[PDB]
Amino acid sequence: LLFETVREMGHEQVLFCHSPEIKAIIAIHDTTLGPAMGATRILPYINEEAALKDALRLSRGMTYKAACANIPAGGGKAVIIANPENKTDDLLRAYGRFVDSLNGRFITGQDVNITPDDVRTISQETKYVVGPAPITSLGVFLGIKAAVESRWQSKRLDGMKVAVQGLGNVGKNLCRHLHEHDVQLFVSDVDPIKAEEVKRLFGATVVEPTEIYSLDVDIFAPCALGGILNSHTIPFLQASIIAGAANNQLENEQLHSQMLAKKGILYSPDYVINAGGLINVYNEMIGYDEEKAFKQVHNIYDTLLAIFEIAKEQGVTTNDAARRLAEDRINNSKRS
Template identity: 40%
Template sequence: MAEFRTIVKHGYEEVALWCDQDVGIEAICAIHSTALGPAIGGTRWQPYADRDAAFADVLRLSEAMTLKSSAARLPFGGGKAVVIGDPAHKTEAQLRSYAEFVNEFEGRYLTTTDVGTTTEEIDQLSQWTPHIVGTSPTLGGSGDTSALTAVTVLNGIYATLDALDGDPDPAGKTIVVVGVGKVGSRVARSLAEDGARVLVADIRAIAAAALAVEIGANTISVDEAFVVPCDVLSPNALGGVFGEETTPALQCRAICGGANNQLVRDPDDAASIAERGILYAPDYVVNSGGVISVAQDVAGWSYARAVEHAEGVFETTRQIFELADRREITTAEAAREFALSQIPTPAS
């Protein structure tokens, strides 16, 4: 029998735990804010070390979704769900049970893909819950969100180059792309077409080598990627890559990529990066293409309108850089201030 239990967490609208021992599933959902609209956030399915690690992740990710939606000027709030388990061994019974969990929120939380979940599984979930976005186009959804995420990352890179040199053109610039999955490969391919000198790195060395051959790039190891001199370092895999151990060795002029939660300790690591004279484009601003993509499902946008909205990340990133300069604060602090300014405060 499944158990739904709400856990009070200061600063969050609701945090709930779902345990269904009959099918062997344990999940946590955090709704950070619905001030702008229903909370949107993917379902992350991975083998966390313990429940505390899962809680820490879901709280951090759900707040980031609030900021991401707000910074992208979308009518959504922020939420996230995590399932503790091996994504390679999930069962239909577990998916059905998880759909029951999503239904408990009665539309206040809408979910889609994330690490460890696929569009095919989201399609399955849509059989048992209507609170799903990002289903495949055959079911009327927006499908794979990587295309628009690449658009927002690229526009973040263009704005970053403009801030560095007064020119958004990547031609002749050295750009290191770490992670050559669906987003990173699109980013690397586009930059190479625009004349940038692209270096690619991935723990899957064969995938990196294949992409490098295709686009005329060079490969380096993941460790090298964080110490090689370059104009822009673009992390597009998992987050938590900039901290006390890595930041002192950085040789890049700027950081701009699609990975979530790139800073180990925000705001401390943002300050350390700034002290090194490195320009940091906040991740949730430049990787907002995924949530913009699902706006097609919820708001009924056309793909063309979604692309136009995604390209607006250039101007948003530029404004955040200017705010940081004007206020003499880090770009991470400026991004948070910018995002929070878009959220209405409750009436007293």
């Protein structure tokens, strides 16, 4: 059961940890480019097969999210079967012992149900924990430029039309960056108060949440929601390029990427642009150095041009291109 699935996904090892009443699973996909990175996640899973399958899927994800980003790191993930109501400090300290067992092979972080104060509780026993908006925002701003180069052939963003979902800190900083390079903005937020501020600050024309998909614009930049590029709303896209900071953008990676491809729209992969958030966490592991971190995010620019180049030469989607680019980077890395 377990071993067959590993053959299809390509994981390195899987720990089933137990004791402080614990039911926890660390899963480690690869450690080729560095030590495996992946956040701790507490959920009350239906059964252990469900717990395992969530641990295998996301761990894989981190391998690909690290490789594209060009950080020396692998893909891991750690999960715990428990109800959020059922917790204590000892359970996290016990879980802390387990990441420490791995001796820095597996470096963890925060995910759903693991608060930053929890991360501290874990930290004392282990020391392999870690814990953003402006770098994520700049990562897109680079990703946007990178995407312009593929089709349009210029680096001047002057007189280009763009649309943004989400005026959260991560998303609004993008408006700032765009406005300051003479870009015309359309803006969308789920609540009324934040949308009004941006109007005042940058002279962006506020729209309702539902209108933004169809606008006659060059670029579309979603920064608040996942599952937006879907057969319902995806037909209305007039945007030539799709670069945004939000995660899980495609409802269905395989289906809805082809929808965009076949209709001539360029999709910058969500998890390559979101990587600014990961490169932030990476530096904290190795001791934070702003000088370097602000360089390391320029990988998104280099990475994406290649993904679009690879998409064309091979005759294939950006998502398939992103895999081959991630994969070949790991394969080639065996010499060093």
